[PDB]
Structure 1
């Protein structure tokens, strides 16, 4: 019998997948998580006692982005091992394909929080390999269900790519992606590429966005904006065609924007 329901902050959330909490915790109906230190608990009384005790009001690590009440914390798995492990256990409840929960030293985690007078409330996160040979700038990315489809996922995708721009490289999320991950990346890629076109080779779209050329070509193939010529993909769009596309349905929700000004980060 596995964990199938978590209480965290002021939310109760049904699980989607098995997560390898210890047998003693899983066997419980509900698991109770501190929203700041991510400690998980078997009972509400221990939860209520921890609440009055916990002095954390935000994730550990360094705050490398803060505009208004949107915030990102950088947390090294080697320096916050227990915390990053609880994060992976929490993330595996809503990620089918994530497999690595306890070996967190090779990763850095980017915690997205929304802030009020009470503290910095966790919305989602993405992980990233310190050294990614396959050139993947995201390892696992997860928005908690009550926050999904509201702009945070798109914020995190954009944020992973800002880091890729500061490292002078391109990157791509590790695969496979969840159903909603597939759709979120295609929507982001469409938006950014389309926005840049109406404002260009395939290679220069790549260097302006840090989106790989494979990701660009596949997105333009879905938009049907690429000609093939003697083994070469070639962009083929009229500026009016770009606008017919960009005023469509899905591109009318005002995003949470990543403001590079407010991004206090530097590359290793």
Structure 2
């Protein structure tokens, strides 16, 4: 498509969909990118050289969260646009439907990186509209293929709530969800609902099960409806199975103590 292959840092990623990447570029069979400034080039050489320049070895904004190897940078669409602009171009290679590219300023971009000697490496990000048409904690979410199926999605998902969590403003993802995203949430809400069942041998509410969580009442209910736990209902034998499951190998989980972020 526009195009077939790209080279990120080291890895070569096979795109899923087209991206506006300027005709002149798109046409080129492979699109070399630069791990950090996210600049599209035309050749390995043009890339290979440019890398002596740059000096960018991590995302533009401030680190809001750093624990162990993982980190998130809250990049403002306004402050450092072109990056965000390029993030969208990169992202669209993996989102079938993605409006907004050039108009980045209205969004905040939260980019997750996995860090080592060579730098703070982009592993994926999520989008969030500054001032919301609909109260919408997630506008977009993406994890690069080479990192997928490793719990980075949930991490980002989870992070996105902690954000709205301490906003007091419980939101939800931009609901025309991709197929992949859909499962990511459906399965995240489950885990996080079945979470509290084992962490409160007392029973209470749905609107309380909210707030203390942030998964808005519309959701989580639809989740429970998708379960054998619809009823505004505890399945002690499942709530067990999952908290039993977690004890095998935990996540790559967000630690709220390790996040420096004030709302508004």
TM-score, normalisation: structure 1: 0.93
Structure 2, unpaired ranges of 5+: none
State the distance in 1 between where 2:149 and 2:206 align: 29
Structure 1, unpaired ranges of 5+: 228-233
Pairing 1:100-179 to 2, within 5 Å after superposition: 100-179=100-179
What is the DSSP-based 3-state SS (H/G/I as helix, E as strand, rest coil) of the residue aligned with 1:51? Answer: coil
Pairing 1:86-105 to 2, within 5 Å after superposition: 86-105=86-105
State the distance in 1 between where 2:241 and 2:33 align: 46
Aligned to 1:224: 228
Contact 1:97-1:176 within 8 A present in 2 as well: no
State the distance in 2 between where 1:206 and 1:238 align: 18
- 1:258 equivalenced with 2:251 (yes/no): no
TM-score, normalisation: structure 2: 0.94
- Report how far residue 240 of structure 1 moved: 3.6
Aligned to 1:26: 26
State the distance in 2 between where 1:220 and 1:175 align: 18
- Report how far residue 2 of structure 1 moved: 2.2
- Report how far residue 133 of structure 1 moved: 3.1
State the distance in 2 between where 1:183 and 1:24 align: 36
State the distance in 1 between where 2:35 and 2:249 align: 28
State the distance in 2 between where 1:148 and 1:125 align: 12
- Report how far residue 241 of structure 1 moved: 4.3
State the distance in 2 between where 1:23 and 1:141 align: 26
How many residues are aligned here? 260
- Report how far residue 247 of structure 1 moved: 4.0
- Report how far residue 104 of structure 1 moved: 0.4
The one-character-per-residue Cα deviations of 1:216-239 (angstroms, maximum 9, x if unpaired) are 101111122122xxxxxx1x1143
State the distance in 2 between where 1:62 and 1:243 align: 40
Q: Which has the higher helix share?
A: 1
State the distance in 2 between where 1:15 and 1:254 align: 31
State the distance in 2 between where 1:181 and 1:105 align: 24
Match of 2:234 among 234, 237, 241: 237
The one-character-per-residue Cα deviations of 1:78-116 (angstroms, maximum 9, x if unpaired) are 111111000000000000121111110100000000000
What is the DSSP-based 3-state SS (H/G/I as helix, E as strand, rest coil) of the residue aligned with 1:85? Answer: helix
State the distance in 1 between where 2:197 and 2:67 align: 28
State the distance in 2 between where 1:251 and 1:178 align: 30
State the distance in 1 between where 2:23 and 2:55 align: 28
